[PDB]
UniProtKB/Swiss-Prot annotation, chain B:
Its EC number is 3.6.4.-. The keyword RNA-binding applies. Belongs to the Rho family. GO terms for cellular component: cytosol; membrane. Each subunit has two RNA-binding sites, one at the surface of the hexameric ring, and one at the center of the open ring structure, where RNA helicase activity is thought to take place. GO terms for molecular function: ATP binding; ATP hydrolysis activity; ATP-dependent activity, acting on RNA; helicase activity; identical protein binding; RNA binding. Residues 275-278 are annotated as: RNA-binding 2. The gene is rho. ATP binds at residues 163-168, 175-180, 206. This is Transcription termination factor Rho. It comes from Escherichia coli (strain K12).
Amino acid sequence: MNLTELKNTPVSELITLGENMGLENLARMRKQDIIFAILKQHAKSGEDIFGDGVLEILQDGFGFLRSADSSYLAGPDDIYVSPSQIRRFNLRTGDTISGKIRPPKEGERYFALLKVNEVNFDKPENNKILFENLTPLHANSRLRMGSTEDLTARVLDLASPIGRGQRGLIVAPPKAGKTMLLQNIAQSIAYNHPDCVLMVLLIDERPEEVTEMQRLVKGEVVASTFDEPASRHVQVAEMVIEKAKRLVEHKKDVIILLDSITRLARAYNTVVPAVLTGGVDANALHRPKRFFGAARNVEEGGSLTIIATALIDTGSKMDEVIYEEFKGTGNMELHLSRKIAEKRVFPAIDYNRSGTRKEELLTTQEELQKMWILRKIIHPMGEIDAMEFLINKLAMTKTNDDFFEMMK
Amino acid sequence: MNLTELKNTPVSELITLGENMGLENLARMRKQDIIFAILKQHAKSGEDIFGDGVLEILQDGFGFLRSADSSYLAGPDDIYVSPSQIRRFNLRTGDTISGKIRPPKEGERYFALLKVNEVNFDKPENNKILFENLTPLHANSRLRMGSTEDLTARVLDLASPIGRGQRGLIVAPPKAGKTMLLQNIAQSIAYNHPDCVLMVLLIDERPEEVTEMQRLVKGEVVASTFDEPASRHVQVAEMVIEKAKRLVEHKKDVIILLDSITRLARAYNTVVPALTGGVDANALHRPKRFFGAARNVEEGGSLTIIATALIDTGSKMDEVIYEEFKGTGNMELHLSRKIAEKRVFPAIDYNRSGTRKEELLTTQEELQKMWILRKIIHPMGEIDAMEFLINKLAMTKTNDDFFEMMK
């Protein structure tokens, strides 16, 4: 029928749909093979089968539209794209392609891209590269964040203002509420900034954790699991980052929530051809540094913002090295405290250690001053005292109300 | 059309430019690829293709004139330079070369240097190497630094004078406005010292930070970013210093502002054939070489370098690196997080800054005047001392302060 919509339907529903086309039980096949079976069998109707996907040009010259719902895991129901088709449109990997598709003829292995309708959500023949846009100081247009969840959005909004195009780093030790923190931001963004394109990208995740994130986030959730090869971790991050740059080349504001730059860097360490610094090849740290390095606010419009957690206190040398190597790359950083989290104060933020560069570019003169006053007062305070002090006081109400009335 | 004018034009403009020449749309290719296309299609006529670049001579004997607007990153529209050209003119890497360029003959990859017009800004057949020029202190001939921004420059000017030839170290903890300082310093060099060649070298930087600087400096701003490799950090750096020597080699005053000598040092540490805290003794050699180059050249010209040394990064190596540079310098500016945390902006902790042979950079009148100031702040603590200096400077400018304030 319509490719994307099929892959978005529960397996069971697909099997019944499959049986009901006289296709003998294939309940024991992978969702994907089923989808393929259902396409090939529903090739009694020219002009119907639509297809969409993100393009990965393989070096032979041809590519594949791959789908975001399998976290771009190459599969039988990917859609071949011809080298000519790539040259006629100036296609480039990362490109989001829609159109019509056609069953393989005698001798092929894949449905093929028959007609290009949309490229990047724009006219297939209508755009200059990420690599050449002037990178202003990620900070003109803020992204602000009566419940308790809002407590995080709110503590966060005082410690570490994020702006369209920030390169943020959440430094988190284990069991320090980093996921909730991430989800809180994903929620904050969906609800406050629908205009921004949201992608959450999960690197070496526990499978169940994926389905959870997958269910809360309004936006693209691509993940790979500790199940899968480093290659596969690398595949996922590469495809995402590229789609990302295409969207930006169109003046869109994309946002990537990267869970675990550090795990990504672990991947590149084992996929990159072998100078050691504590386990990690220096040469490896390149591609990651690239990935984060892309975050930027574009002068001609659009924004690529990236927030990535960096794991710490895991008692692994390499995790520690990777952190040190990113120290300074970012322009917003938010520290989580094991201490605060051992004690159960939840937004677990180290206000004294977090903050962003060029805040003045992301706040009003009124806001900063107010922030600066709050800061004067939290400096001497201890990690834990500092969070509690800020919550009990935020507990009064909202954010402006907080201060305006606190001044008595 | 004109290579370098071609390099200094905005992509969109180059796009509309190439499209006119009936070039089928290129927006999707790299600034340098677009430039090459535009150059290729401009294959007719023949005497209207001029090139310039800094020369990099690879060991195989040949070289490329590489472009400063790319921070000398090997790319397509690099110009090929032949051994025979290298040898007929006794060219050396660093050498800034101008002339006509010809497209690639079929089988070739690059436009080629057709005719050498100018070398290092001089007649191609017109200099003793930097490495054998007498190296005075440079205490001689000073580089001095109405509105509130001069407060920085004027504090700098009393705390730690800089001379044509200084080998200054700026010691900077994080968030102590070490960048503003640099930008201040550069602005002060452009307005006051237009005659001196200004080179701003950014080592391991954030892209956005690069484009800021590139937009304030009046001079050459060469930068590698953190997405590039150690090799590239090293490259940019080594290409910069050489271009500086060849220019001192012609009696010019050159000032390099080096943001993080310490990053440069990280670069060398990974790139160098393989410890004291993660850092191999052997690596620092070149960094020191680079820093070591600063000098007032007796036979004319001078190479001055001011570099930041990052500190309090909680990184062992950053720490050992600063260690290894102590005493290599002849001016230092210390920045203090304290003064910073309290929103004072100059940062400089007076009592720990200073330059050597001040007497050579300062008339006897002024020297004494500074000694008194010094006697007075000495007991004061950091914060105090800056705040004291900023109120008392805020009343006026340079000389016109001391006079009256004394009675």
